[PDB]
């Protein structure tokens, strides 16, 4: 269930390898990416963290899991804030 993805966090400068779980929800994904970003190179802020396929416009439902997303290993995702 170890699931590698490449993730770009809002306002960061790069894309990183984050290993998430097949059974993580989008909320738990956002959290694992944020660990390597917020308070390191990205300032903390209020709001809800959302996950989406790289530069996609449709967001993934917060409770949806990796397995249910259709995402493949090593694909790129963005983590952004509800607007």
């Amino acid at each position: 269930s170890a699931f590698p993805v490449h993730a770009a966090f809002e306002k960061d400068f790069l894309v990183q390898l984050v290993v998430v779980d097949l059974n993580d929800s989008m909320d738990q994904v956002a959290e694992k990416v944020a660990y390597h970003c917020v308070n390191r190179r990205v300032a903390p802020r209020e709001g809800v963290m959302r996950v989406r396929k790289h530069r996609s416009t449709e967001l993934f439902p917060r409770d949806m899991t990796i397995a249910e997303s259709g995402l493949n290993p090593t694909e790129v995702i963005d983590v952004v804030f509800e607007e």
Binding site: L14, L17, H36, N39, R40, H54, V76
Partner: protein, 492 residues
Amino acid sequence: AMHPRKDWYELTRATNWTPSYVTEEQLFPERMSGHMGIPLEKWESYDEPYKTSYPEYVSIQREKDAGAYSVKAALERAKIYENSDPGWISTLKSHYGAIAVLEYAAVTGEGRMARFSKAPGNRNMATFGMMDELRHGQLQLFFPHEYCKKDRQFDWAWRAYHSNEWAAIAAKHFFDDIITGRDAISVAIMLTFSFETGFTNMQFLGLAADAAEAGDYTFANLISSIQTDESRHAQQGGPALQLLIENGKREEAQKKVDMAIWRAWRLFAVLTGPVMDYYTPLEDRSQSFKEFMYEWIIGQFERSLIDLGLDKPWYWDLFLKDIDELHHSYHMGVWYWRTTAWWNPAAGVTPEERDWLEEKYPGWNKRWGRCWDVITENVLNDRMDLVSPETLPSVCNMSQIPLVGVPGDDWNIEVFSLEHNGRLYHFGSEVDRWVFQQDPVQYQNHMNIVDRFLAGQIQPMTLEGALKYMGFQSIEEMGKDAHDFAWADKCK
């Protein structure tokens, strides 16, 4: 009496003949020669514009080295190593590691031409080119050698190219592609013309100016002397290009130049960019990285490219924008992952430096400044765990460099992906993906460091495992902040 070179020069390159006992194609196989079907007789009009001859060459090269070594010897006690700003020392470490053994590899690029070029003049000038690069590799091993006893990081002057350290893989992927991994004509065009008449001026002359401002004349004198050889042997590409255009191969020629310039740009902005705008002390920055780019690449090289009858690369506007942005993110990536480098990156973000950055790149503080604000705060508050990474950056399948974008207020980052033969590749630019598509067999089964990490080749699969994989041999060898974070004391 002696007779003037003009009177006998023609006989020195009257060396083409018609093969009879093997075929022409057997003597000059396309995979090694790259003649593109152009017959022998057509190559006899190649006329190298920067000529030399054997007696002059040994005489003059003897004089060049006499001076290079004399200056080094006279300045041994100048205290450069002890008295220099640590960021300057890192510049030396990174330069020698990235360059010394690569110069030696460039001998094989020149040898490929000396044997497999169908142009007689090319084969002779490449023979002198072989010698020049031998000189450069030997100088740049000899010069850093004395510092081995002072710092193990100088061991990388020899070791870098024998390692799997990420930046060394990035250098090798690029240089094995344009120097050692292609036919004679591709070398002439991609290395002598594209790389050696534009980009090398950045590192060997732009950097020399900074070195002179920094009072390091042993180094400035060395690299400028080295570039006088380059100015001669790099002039092998122009004639080859003109010949290709005259024989109806403009398109193929243009494609080779387009590819080489971009690949050179990406790599050389990970090394020279940070040096010029961050490692070099503020008061020694002759010009910014962008200013040097506009002098050497846009102003000089571009104009020369146009004079020879080629067009601005299709990606020109993408390139110009990149010059404003790429290296600031490369610097951040190299500094935040400093432990994976064999030199000690200087953060270069004290307020006075940030004012300069803002002048040279209006908007800088609202972009990369945002990340540096967070980093600076963590340092000031002794939260060092947040100033070191616990994962890997995602890495371009072409350039072998982390995938980056613009951070801060107008955040923008893009990865360009590609499926090919049942594999997913990611690239840091449209151009990088295009390069891959121009010659998939060159690249298709190469695995970048992160692909290797995910495929179980790096054991243990941890940040420490990757460091040992990258060839580090002691705690001292790994990169740290150049000033031990002392720079934070000026951010109060």
